[PDB]
Design a protein around this ligand. Structure first.
Ligand SMILES: Cc1ncc(C[n+]2csc(CCOP(=O)(O)OP(=O)(O)O)c2C)c(N)n1
Ligand SMILES: Cc1ncc(C[n+]2csc(CCOP(=O)(O)OP(=O)(O)O)c2C)c(N)n1
Ligand SMILES: [K+]
Ligand SMILES: [K+]
Ligand SMILES: [K+]
Ligand SMILES: [K+]
Ligand SMILES: [Mg+2]
Ligand SMILES: [Mg+2]
Lengths: 366, 336, 336, 366
């Protein structure tokens, strides 16, 4: 051999390597029964109830905000249907300070981390309570306190960024891991190849969490890739990989818990591909709760009622708050405000003094 | 809405802007057996319906989806064009054309020059939704033309209506140079007018004076043309000012002569665009007009543009260079 | 050679431009434990020697190579900066910064604004060799600053000498905004002068009048500053013309006041840059000066720039805006 | 299962897939002996001698042009040392009209396709005979007649372009394949991920030929990737792959011949990773020639002499030709020449009329 590119022997016959099916890891069946006792995480009742309540509260909020979008009360919305288990299950396996990068289906991570209903709604309405100052489109959430990096629209850009944050974590040596969520469509972007390769060659403690639901808008996966999903790409980058049942919160939890443990200890990336769709994560966990004697019909009714009420109170409040001062359109472009940008801000103030009646000033703060 | 749209080649039919794009694409594939259309989600008709019915009519090998990768879409399109086949690539939003910047600027724009014309990708056209839409915020509202204007080798074209869009898109598709065609998405449904059913061409690098005037020249492109048309009306009504309204249409190579001829006559110029001021294309037009019409300029050229910030969500009404902002600038320039 | 280089903070030592960059990087890593330097082939010292000895001095975890992927290098740098650590990324040639355009324009530039300042990547600096070099042709000669000038949220800085490079690079590294620092590669070895051994800063967004004059204002940046300095000498000797020579230094946010103050005094302005004319940054300076100094302008502002073509190999001598091209334009402007 | 992302079954235990060594295919040993008779391509003596002469003539040209660069007679140069076999061997397996995309180490493909020494040198000198009109840096070759797409400096950009040309070939249905050469360093670019994925999902008749020599400038492959080279990435994209001995022209020929046959028949991509270094391809083939009685010391001396002579005649001629008319700096930016660009051309002509003495006009045509 003696080649500086790859360790291998010689072969004397011409043989092309064919795309050599990764199995889907499952812990509980559609009836909520633990399939293999040695894989039961035996999470405490309080934690499991928190998984269930976080998922259902997200679903309740989704229903109301979806309707809100349909009435044109908010300009855009993305639901979390089918993704409640992948996000609450994986979030439960993380340490509270582990940094999260994501895209559009990660609100369940924030919900598990106790992000206020008031803040989810402030962002969607772009009101004065939004720490994002109403600058981005709805569902572009971010929370510095809960280590959830602000979402941006360009797909996959957060992947190599998540790798850099992980490299810095390694250097700071404080036992933290970074998790980066993305869809199978986003995995087609060049930024995905960059992130996976950099994470492996620079030995970064990061978990890549790919949600594969078979579609990127109208595009089926048959038009997205030809190998065996995204999990099959991991080995080629030298990344430990696994495929899991996205409708099974326990399977998701187990895979994320072990990936986190090894990523932080070994400074090596892990790839988890969770299969989901359009046997729903909420339905399956509820069956489990019943079998343990941890939930019943009366508790379900009381919760559905308390959650609807909590969501509507936040909703009504969000709608009556004013939007931020228009001056906020000019700050944070740079940390400080360049004199030429201030000149533009002053230009607007002068314009509104004269033509203000033609603008929706009554809706904005100050 | 911040604007108001207001509406020889044979039979015509009322068409909104997305329908006129579909008509241009249909005419193209019908008369060019090599032509193919590809991108993100174009198979089922597109997220703005611009390719509805084309796959059923021309075949899945001619209207198809690609993996989600803009750099790939452009490199792939370039490769098709290198063989001489017509490649019409779609980038879902102009805000997402950036991953393909290297393929556009270092490759497509330089392909012919660097090979001494042994190879080229002249049969490539990239079409992409463009401009503000009321709530698109940072990544569904951008106007990237100035970034492309600094790249010799490509053409950048922006229509203001359905009739203009079909004629200009057909010209881009047939032009022998890689072209980027930006479709003002706020007009996809909003603007509807009579459009010839058969193919016709509108020349590239030719501005259009849509209203003669004698006191000041107003220049814009895309949706902003309708804003300055209204501003012309306000100036006439409120100030007794005669405005000459010009739709630039082609960003590069631009129609320097039509613009200078107009300014030599009026002696005043106001350029407006949704894109940020600094580095915006109005700077190029202004510097050039100043060089060619110094002796005729009666007042400084004004640029009424978006502010030097990313495009905001809730503050959009305050960000755009609306009719009141344009009118006020014009009032001050007249008073100079 | 088309130019001629011609040369308080404590002890100094003679240093050429690449040595002054190394000195800035050394000072930075010494005083900032979080700082790391990464890119293509930076470990062994770099293809232009700017990182020689740094890995041995600070460790392989602080000065390291990345896979060959510019989009990755910038996204990775952004991620490091998001945690608050100083990230100094190297792009091997400015011509190869394009694959990273989306990460720079849609991500780094907008990071702070779009999160309401909950997150930022202000501790990121991207350094990259820039400008012509006599035979670099299309992809080893580019001056991309105008593409970046149209993007609110980033700073673009270009030095003209070793002393200026270390002070400006230290300011970029310490600035709280993502910065792109372009190093004129033709000067890496050619320009050598006394440079303080300890760290010092030169302010960003501040131009420098390097020669007072009263008849005309000349503005340039990078290597072109030395060309206009020579042109000032030619004008004085051959025409009895007093030229004010200004090094812009920061492309964006640029020093509008220093430039306008100079033009209000002289009444004439000539801007020169290696980059192509159309869409070049001289258009922004010209349009702005015209708006602020209309009453003082005695003649049209001239832009002496590269032609609107890709940068050629064998024709470089004929392409660049050399001293004779600048001088002739100045002669005509004086004669206006 | 029932998931639209990947065909697979369930697994009841948590198991991470580990980066599971691809062997190196070899036909002849370092002594030029055929290792396995069933793998002998039995190429005719005339063809094999052409492989040998193309490789050695390239080496002779490299030596002279390298020295030329050192004396500053040409501004830049890239040699082909160690890559003679991968390129002449693969080129011999292609049909003459198969379209080639490459980067800097592909001159042997042109040499095999009988590209004139005069044209290799015209490009390096940027003289009047260069069809590229002296616009690009040396070794940026291109030949429309020999279906070799002009090289450009930005790494990996030609990969997705090669896939698009292959898609068009498929549609034109004329039994043609596209081959695209690149290095293991270039495989790290996002454009490489784009090309591989598009080729698989759009079913394109293309051969990806990756040269892995263990280094990208000063970067060892340990800092470039962590999986088993580039060949190991093929399966994950659903691409048939193979690794071959780059110092063995016959192994390279066999792999390329079979990849071409199947790519064109099945409209599917193939990935060949050829291992090379800094047992040299020329030395190994010469041993084979001797064993067949096809070459001897006297023939070697006569050829070394005839090649040196052929190369120096082209060299002397290239150096005395003038450079192209400076007007050529303005054409081909667009097919036609925009009036504003012509204005700039006229501006230069006027400038030279007055200041011409300050320019090297005596060296340029007209
Ligand atoms: C660079 C870029 N290209 C295109 C889009 C438009 N877009 C938004 S979501 C989407 C589909 C994403 O698919 P996937 O990653 O699989 O996630 P899913 O929505 O199925 O969860 C597309 C093409 C975008 N936001 N950014
Ligand atoms: C986009 C881009 N980035 C960086 C470079 C500079 N560069 C030229 S060759 C090279 C190494 C290429 O390595 P590889 O692809 O493995 O090929 P090899 O030279 O070993 O045959 C680099 C980084 C470039 N030309 N283009
Ligand atoms: K993103
Ligand atoms: K075209
Ligand atoms: K900085
Ligand atoms: K290339
Ligand atoms: Mg999906
Ligand atoms: Mg290599």
């Amino acid at each position: 051999p003696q080649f500086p590119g790859a360790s291998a022997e010689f072969i004397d016959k011409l043989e092309f390597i064919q795309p050599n099916g990764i199995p889907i890891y499952r812990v509980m069946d559609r009836q909520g029964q633990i399939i293999n006792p040695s894989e039961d995480p035996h999470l405490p009742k309080e934690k499991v109830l928190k998984l269930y309540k976080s998922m259902t509260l997200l679903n309740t909020m989704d229903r109301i905000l979806y309707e809100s979008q349909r009435q044109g009360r908010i300009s855009f919305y993305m639901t979390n249907y089918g993704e409640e288990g992948t996000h609450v299950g994986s979030a439960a396996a993380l340490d509270n300070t582990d940094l999260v990068f994501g895209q559009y289906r990660e609100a369940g991570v924030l919900m598990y981390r106790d992000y206020p209903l008031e803040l989810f709604m402030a962002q969607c309405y772009g009101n004065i309570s939004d720490l994002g100052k109403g600058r981005q489109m709805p569902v572009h959430y971010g929370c510095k306190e809960r280590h959830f990096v602000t979402i941006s629209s360009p797909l996959a850009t957060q992947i190599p960024q998540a790798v850099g944050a992980a490299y810095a974590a390694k250097r700071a040596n404080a036992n933290r891991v970074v998790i980066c969520y993305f869809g199978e469509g986003a995995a087609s972007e060049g930024d995905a190849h960059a992130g996976f390769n950099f994470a492996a060659t620079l030995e970064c403690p990061i978990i890549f969490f790919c949600r594969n639901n078979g579609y990127a808008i109208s595009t089926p996966t048959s038009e997205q890739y030809r190998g065996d999903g995204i999990a099959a790409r991991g080995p080629g980058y030298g990344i430990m990989s696994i495929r899991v049942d996205g409708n099974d919160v326990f399977a998701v939890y187990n895979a994320t818990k072990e990936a986190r443990r090894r990523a932080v200890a070994e400074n090596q990336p892990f790839l988890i591909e969770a299969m989901t769709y359009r046997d729903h994560p909420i339905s399956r966990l509820r069956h489990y709760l019943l079998s343990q004697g941890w939930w019943d019909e009366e508790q379900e009714k009381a919760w559905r009622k308390q959650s609807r009420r909590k969501v509507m109170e936040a909703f009504e409040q969000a709608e009556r708050k004013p939007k931020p001062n228009p001056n906020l359109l000019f700050s944070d472009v740079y940390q400080e405000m360049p004199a030429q940008l201030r000149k533009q801000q002053e230009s607007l103030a002068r314009h509104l003094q004269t033509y203000g009646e033609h603008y929706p000033l009554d809706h904005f703060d100050k | 809405a911040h604007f108001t749209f207001q509406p020889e080649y044979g039979q015509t039919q009322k068409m909104n802007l997305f329908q006129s794009v579909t008509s241009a694409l249909d005419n193209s594939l019908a008369k060019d057996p090599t032509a193919v259309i590809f991108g993100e989600d174009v198979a089922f008709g597109g997220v703005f319906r611009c390719t509805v019915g084309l796959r059923d009519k021309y075949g899945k090998d001619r209207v198809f989806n690609t993996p989600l990768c803009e750099q790939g879409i452009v490199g792939f399109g370039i490769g098709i064009a290198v063989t001489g086949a017509t490649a019409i690539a779609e980038i879902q939003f102009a805000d997402y054309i950036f991953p393909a910047f290297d393929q556009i600027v270092n490759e497509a724009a330089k392909y012919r020059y660097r090979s001494g014309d042994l190879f080229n990708c002249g049969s490539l056209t990239i079409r992409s939704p463009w401009g503000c839409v009321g709530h698109g915020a940072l990544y569904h509202s951008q106007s990237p033309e100035a970034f492309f204007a600094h790249c010799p080798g490509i053409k950048v074209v922006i229509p203001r209506s359905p009739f203009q869009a079909k004629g200009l898109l057909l010209s881009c598709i047939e032009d022998k140079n890689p072209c980027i065609f930006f479709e003002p998405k706020i007009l996809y449904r909003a603007a509807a007018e009579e459009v010839p059913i058969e193919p016709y061409n509108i020349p590239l690098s030719q501005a259009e004076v849509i209203q003669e005037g004698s006191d000041v020249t107003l220049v814009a492109w895309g949706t902003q043309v309708h804003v300055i048309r209204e501003v012309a009306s306000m100036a006439k009504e409120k100030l007794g000012v005669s405005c000459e309204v010009i739709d630039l249409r082609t960003i590069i190579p631009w129609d320097v002569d039509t613009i200078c001829k107009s300014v030599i006559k009026t002696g005043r110029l106001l350029i407006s665009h949704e894109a940020p001021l600094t580095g915006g294309f109005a700077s190029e037009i202004s510097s050039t007009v100043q060089e060619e019409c110094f002796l005729n300029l009666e007042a400084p050229i004004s640029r009424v543009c978006g502010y030097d910030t990313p495009f905001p969500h809730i503050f959009e009404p305050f960000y755009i260079p609306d009719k009141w902002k344009c009118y006020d600038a014009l009032r001050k320039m007249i008073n100079y």
